[PDB]
């Protein structure tokens, strides 16, 4: 049962309490969510997330043409 056993969506590993963060309602390690095109550790601070994939703002703009915003 998931109570104190959260499973991560950015690396699918069970997240431990200190690392258990919730970005965009997805529960994961604060340390793991990187861009799906480049393993850029964009975790918590400046990131662009999409259903399924976490993307860096530059790649998100080019590849998905969704958000990004890097003085753009
Ligand atoms: Zn993770
Ligand atoms: Zn990227």
From Swiss-Prot:
Induction: Over-expressed in breast, bladder, melanoma and thyroid cancer cell lines and tumors (at protein level). Zn(2+) 2 binds at residues 35, 38, 56, 59. May play a role in tumor progression via its ability to activate the ILK protein-kinase activity. Interacts with ILK. Residues 6-66 form the LIM zinc-binding domain. It comes from Homo sapiens (Human). The chain holds residues 33 to 104 of 127 of the full protein. Zn(2+) 1 binds at residues 8, 11, 29, 32. It is found in: Cytoplasm; Nucleus. This is LIM domain-containing protein 2.
């Amino acid at each position: 049962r998931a109570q104190v056993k959260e499973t991560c969506a950015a690396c699918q590993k069970t997240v431990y309490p200190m690392e258990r963060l919730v970005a965009d309602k997805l529960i994961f390690h604060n340390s793991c969510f990187c861009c799906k095109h480049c393993h850029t550790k964009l975790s918590l601070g400046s990131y662009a997330a999409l259903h399924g994939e976490f993307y860096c703002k530059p790649h998100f703009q080019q590849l998905f043409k969704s958000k990004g915003n890097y003085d753009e």
